[PDB]
Amino acid sequence: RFLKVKNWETDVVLTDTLHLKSTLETGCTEHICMGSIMLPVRTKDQLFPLAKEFLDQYYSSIKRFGSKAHMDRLEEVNKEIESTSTYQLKDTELIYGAKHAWRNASRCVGRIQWSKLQVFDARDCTTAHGMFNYICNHVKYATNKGNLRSAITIFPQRTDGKHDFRVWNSQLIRYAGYKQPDGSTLGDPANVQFTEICIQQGWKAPRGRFDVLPLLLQANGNDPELFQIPPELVLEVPIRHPKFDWFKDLGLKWYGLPAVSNMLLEIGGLEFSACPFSGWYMGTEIGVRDYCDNSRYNILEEVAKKMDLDMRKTSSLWKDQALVEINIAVLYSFQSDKVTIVDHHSATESFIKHMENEYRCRGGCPADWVWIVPPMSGSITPVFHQEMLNYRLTPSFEYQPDPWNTHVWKG
Amino acid sequence: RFLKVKNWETDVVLTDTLHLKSTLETGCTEHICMGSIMLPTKDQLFPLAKEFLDQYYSSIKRFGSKAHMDRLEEVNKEIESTSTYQLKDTELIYGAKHAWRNASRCVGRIQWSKLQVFDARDCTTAHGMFNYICNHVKYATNKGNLRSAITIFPQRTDGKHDFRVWNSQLIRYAGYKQPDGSTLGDPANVQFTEICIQQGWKAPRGRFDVLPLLLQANGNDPELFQIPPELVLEVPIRHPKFDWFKDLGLKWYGLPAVSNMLLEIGGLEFSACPFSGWYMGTEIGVRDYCDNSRYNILEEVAKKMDLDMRKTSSLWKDQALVEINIAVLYSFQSDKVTIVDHHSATESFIKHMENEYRCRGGCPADWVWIVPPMSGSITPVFHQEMLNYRLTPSFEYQPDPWNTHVW
Numbered sequence: 001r002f003l004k005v006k007n008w009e010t011d012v013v014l015t016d017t018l019h020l021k022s023t024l025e026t027g028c029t030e031h032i033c034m035g036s037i038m039l040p041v042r043t044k045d046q047l048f049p050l051a052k053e054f055l056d057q058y059y060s061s062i063k064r065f066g067s068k069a070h071m072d073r074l075e076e077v078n079k080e081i082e083s084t085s086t087y088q089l090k091d092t093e094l095i096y097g098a099k100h101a102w103r104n105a106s107r108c109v110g111r112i113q114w115s116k117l118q119v120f121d122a123r124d125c126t127t128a129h130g131m132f133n134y135i136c137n138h139v140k141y142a143t144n145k146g147n148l149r150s151a152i153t154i155f156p157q158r159t160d161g162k163h164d165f166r167v168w169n170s171q172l173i174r175y176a177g178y179k180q181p182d183g184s185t186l187g188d189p190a191n192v193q194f195t196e197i198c199i200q201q202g203w204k205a206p207r208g209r210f211d212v213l214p215l216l217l218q219a220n221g222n223d224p225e226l227f228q229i230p231p232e233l234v235l236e237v238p239i240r241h242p243k244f245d246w247f248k249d250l251g252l253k254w255y256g257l258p259a260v261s262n263m264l265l266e267i268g269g270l271e272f273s274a275c276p277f278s279g280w281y282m283g284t285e286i287g288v289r290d291y292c293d294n295s296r297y298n299i300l301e302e303v304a305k306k307m308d309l310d311m312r313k314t315s316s317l318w319k320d321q322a323l324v325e326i327n328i329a330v331l332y333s334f335q336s337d338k339v340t341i342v343d344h345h346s347a348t349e350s351f352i353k354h355m356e357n358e359y360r361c362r363g364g365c366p367a368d369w370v371w372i373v374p375p376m377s378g379s380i381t382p383v384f385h386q387e388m389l390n391y392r393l394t395p396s397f398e399y400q401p402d403p404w405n406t407h408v409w410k411g
Numbered sequence: 412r413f414l415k416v417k418n419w420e421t422d423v424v425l426t427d428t429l430h431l432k433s434t435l436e437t438g439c440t441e442h443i444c445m446g447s448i449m450l451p452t453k454d455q456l457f458p459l460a461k462e463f464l465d466q467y468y469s470s471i472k473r474f475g476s477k478a479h480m481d482r483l484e485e486v487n488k489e490i491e492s493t494s495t496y497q498l499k500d501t502e503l504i505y506g507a508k509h510a511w512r513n514a515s516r517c518v519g520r521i522q523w524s525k526l527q528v529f530d531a532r533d534c535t536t537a538h539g540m541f542n543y544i545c546n547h548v549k550y551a552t553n554k555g556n557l558r559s560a561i562t563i564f565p566q567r568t569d570g571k572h573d574f575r576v577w578n579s580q581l582i583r584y585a586g587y588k589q590p591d592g593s594t595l596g597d598p599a600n601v602q603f604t605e606i607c608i609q610q611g612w613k614a615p616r617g618r619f620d621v622l623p624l625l626l627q628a629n630g631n632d633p634e635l636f637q638i639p640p641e642l643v644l645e646v647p648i649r650h651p652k653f654d655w656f657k658d659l660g661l662k663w664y665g666l667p668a669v670s671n672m673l674l675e676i677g678g679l680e681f682s683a684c685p686f687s688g689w690y691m692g693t694e695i696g697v698r699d700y701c702d703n704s705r706y707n708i709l710e711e712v713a714k715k716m717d718l719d720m721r722k723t724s725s726l727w728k729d730q731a732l733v734e735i736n737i738a739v740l741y742s743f744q745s746d747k748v749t750i751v752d753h754h755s756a757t758e759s760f761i762k763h764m765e766n767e768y769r770c771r772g773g774c775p776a777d778w779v780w781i782v783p784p785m786s787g788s789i790t791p792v793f794h795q796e797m798l799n800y801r802l803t804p805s806f807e808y809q810p811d812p813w814n815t816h817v818w
């Protein structure tokens with residue numbers, strides 16, 4: 001079955017056959033599309049098919065499908081599962097696995113970069129302290145004094161689901177939010193709940209507007225424990241504007257390393273529940289969402305007040321105007337400090353080239369339009385006019401419930 | 412089977428039950444999502460009729476009653492004999508209003524119940540059609556105080572006797588191929604503007620030339636008509652702060668009036684049914700002026716603001732985009748032609764969703780089309796989960812007639 005996508009700006013039509021390798025589900029039916037819904041212990045029984053599916057992919061990719069080496073690895077994995085109920089990936093499989101989870105990540109605009117990923121194998125880790133050390137090294141390597149490199153750190157896989165490695169932070173670096181008794185928030189309102197957990201656990205809160213949260217780390221299903229990332233490892237950029245001099249007096253800064261720590265990496269049926277990965281920012285992830293969501297830093301008011309915009313009728317487009325200046329400032333602040341960053345025009349163009357190369361060379365490119373198009377200026381970036389097909393390939397990154405909801409407290 | 416939708420800014424959760432009364436297909440499977448794709452006998456007509464008449468008699472609190480059963484029998488008889496049926500006026504008004512209520516791609520639907528329906532089912536020629544359309548345009552324009560309306564020409568019979576409006580909108584600017592190599596006017600209509608010339612259009616060759624109507628009645632060859640210029644309310648565009656703006660000499664029309672769609676009520680197909688409401692500002696400023704495919708005037712503008720056009724990262728496209736849109740909105744409001752900004756339109760649609768969950772058990776919404784093509788995440792719809800499903804009565808795309816017409 002052939003599926004076709006069109007670009008309405010250029011009339012380029014592409015053909016997807018890759019959807020024919022699709023495994024998991026979308027949440028969509030013939031009767032409903034759930035394309036805009038955010039969220040739409042395993043036995044031998046299901047594991048070997050998945051193992052086999054993976055090893056077939058791997059061995060195709062390295063040009064060895066049906067080789068001795070391939071048949072041997074198959075039998076070897078077979079035995080290990082029948083003998084222990086699980087199995088272990090070779091280094092090369094792990095690497096290939098993590099690279100493809102990113103390649104298959106349909107909500108990610110950054111995938112032109114997919115082959116350049118530094119994989120750190122933390123599968124010998126046994127304690128939270130070991131976890132901390134691995135993460136610090138991750139952050140230092142990735143940061144690279146502002147010349148960011150993509151990386152991921154992979155901790156031991158799930159066994160019985162009672163011995164899980166988890167990183168309780170949703171990103172390795174993030175600011176505290178503190179709900180006040182007057183009902184207002186200090187710092188980042190996205191992180192209030194997790195900030196409370198940290199305090200509960202015994203973090204001493206500086207109670208500032210930009211406090212870097214401490215890592216909260218669970219090893220081998222144990223209760224998790226706290227650790228401050230050394231401040232010298234945390235690259236930050238003060239936010240200033242090129243024409244606007246009052247902007248710095250807003251007292252804003254942001255960290256340079258986006259590092260997602262809360263997802264689950266699935267490779268050949270195995271489940272890696274701590275696999276923090278990091279890249280570099282698209283300006284709009286800070287400029288639009290972090291500063292200008294209402295449920296976030298919500299600084300459009302202040303930028304607008306200070307810009308002396310007409311704020312009496314929404315149709316002055318005063319919000320639209322402030323939003324642009326803030327994003328101008330974000331790109332400008334990062335670039336002056338030589339901290340790697342991409343603007344949304346650049347990132348979408350690259351992604352369209354990636355996507356076409358993926359169709360030509362791989363037979364498709366799962367793409368989630370709701371997440372790929374940027375959250376400002378949608379229609380003047382070329383992704384807006386691009387038809388995309390969304391589907392789930394493995395290896396993959398998955399959401400997983402927050403650990404404070406599922407953890408049995410050992411005390 | 413009871414589906415939840417969450418807003419991520421307000422944490423408000425809604426429960427959709429209306430989707431189980433859902434009829435047609437989406438395009439998507441549990442394997443592949445087609446959300447971002449633009450276009451994904453009498454033995455069959457009676458169920459369709461009944462489905463409709465049941466919802467009609469239910470809406471007037473007269474479900475399972477004498478009049479109800481009487482009507483279902485009458486339509487059954489008419490189908491068995493004639494192979495089609497005719498809608499009562501009341502059913503007509505209800506069907507049209509609901510095709511708009513079910514339009515999953517329309518941010519504007521808080522307005523659904525205030526629609527003026529013009530019954531043109533007695534129409535028989537292209538001249539007739541033209542008269543009905545002039546009257547629609549005049550009524551809906553209302554010297555700037557725009558009012559929603561729809562004009563419904565006769566339903567499909569055997570499919571060789573179709574009424575069609577060949578224009579995609581009643582009112583649109585011409586677009587001509589150029590020796591130079593660039594495109595003159597509006598490039599979206601190039602093919603259409605040529606077919607006009609070819610049937611004999613008096614093309615004046617300009618950049619804002621209102622296209623002639625091109626009307627087919629009862630399956631016959633189509634005919635040309637110039638909407639009286641005095642019926643087409645246009646707006647010169649100017650900036651509230653940039654005095655040089657006017658020198659671009661931009662104008663846009665007040666009336667958006669979709670005319671290439673099909674209206675399905677109770678199994679019947681009304682293939683000529685142009686409808687109109689009023690513009691959201693971004694429809695003109697973001698898309699009409701700034702698309703590569705369209706007037707593409709960002710480059711020309713940004714220069715006048717003297718912005719650093721050297722690097723994408725100065726966000727010069729974004730800066731200019733905003734001022735262009737401030738200007739469209741400003742002009743319309745100053746010439747007193749109805750217009751809505753995206754902040755207000757999206758806010759209104761959230762109020763509308765709430766209502767439709769409360770009162771109907773849901774509201775099919777297509778997020779890809781609802782979120783404005785600029786400033787998405789600062790409008791409330793961005794954070795709003797939506798379910799997309801096809802209800803009836805409804806509007807549908809149909810082939811451009813020229814790719815289908817027996818000429």
Ligand code: HEM
Pocket residue numbers: 098101102105107108109110111113117150151152263277278279280281282285342347371397
């Ligand atoms: C090269 C730098 C990168 C850039 C500029 C980039 C860009 C982005 C952006 C803007 C998003 C959406 C964020 C949002 O909508 O809130 C995203 C999503 C995502 N990206 Fe990337 N990305 C990069 C590298 C990576 C890497 C290294 C990985 C992992 C190997 C990754 C995996 C993902 C995943 C799983 C999502 C979706 C997360 C979710 O569903 O919540 N990206 N990407």
Ligand code: HEM
Pocket residue numbers: 510511514516517518519520522526559560561686687688689690691694751756780806
């Ligand atoms: C009253 C003010 C109205 C506003 C502000 C409005 C707004 C919009 C917007 C912004 C779109 C997006 C389409 C695009 O970007 O091209 C749209 C599409 C649509 N609206 Fe409305 N609308 C209005 C009235 C109406 C009326 C009167 C009807 C029908 C009775 C209608 C039915 C539709 C349909 C069917 C679409 C999708 C058309 C397509 O698939 O191309 N709307 N509307």
Ligand SMILES: Cc1cc(N)nc(CCc2cc(C#N)cc(CCc3cc(C)cc(N)n3)c2)c1
Pocket residue numbers: 038039110190258259260277278279280281282285399
């Ligand atoms: C490596 C990398 C590089 C880069 N430039 N950007 C990213 C994505 C980062 C991200 C940040 C936030 C925030 N704040 C939320 C998110 C999504 C939060 C979320 C929330 C929910 C409810 C579900 C779900 N799947 N995801 C992602 C990653």
Ligand SMILES: Cc1cc(N)nc(CCc2cc(C#N)cc(CCc3cc(C)cc(N)n3)c2)c1
Pocket residue numbers: 449450667668669686687688689690691694698699808
């Ligand atoms: C009544 C009303 C009010 C209002 N404010 N806006 C509308 C939509 C009008 C419209 C504008 C464009 C454009 N540009 C394209 C279109 C059609 C774009 C299109 C194109 C194709 C190929 C299929 C399809 N379903 N739609 C419509 C209507």
Ligand SMILES: C[C@H](O)[C@H](O)[C@H]1CNc2nc(N)[nH]c(=O)c2N1
Pocket residue numbers: 008384385386387388446447448449779780781
């Ligand atoms: C492929 C993609 O869905 C397509 O370009 C859509 C996206 N969203 C849109 N949204 C609106 N309102 N109007 C459009 O024309 C489009 N185009």
Ligand SMILES: C[C@H](O)[C@H](O)[C@H]1CNc2nc(N)[nH]c(=O)c2N1
Pocket residue numbers: 036037038370371372417419793794795796797
């Ligand atoms: C409800 C809606 O699906 C949700 O808020 C999505 C929309 N698109 C998004 N797109 C990106 N890139 N990131 C997001 O968090 C979201 N949020």
Ligand SMILES: [Zn+2]
Pocket residue numbers: 028032033034035439443444445446
């Ligand atoms: Zn879908």
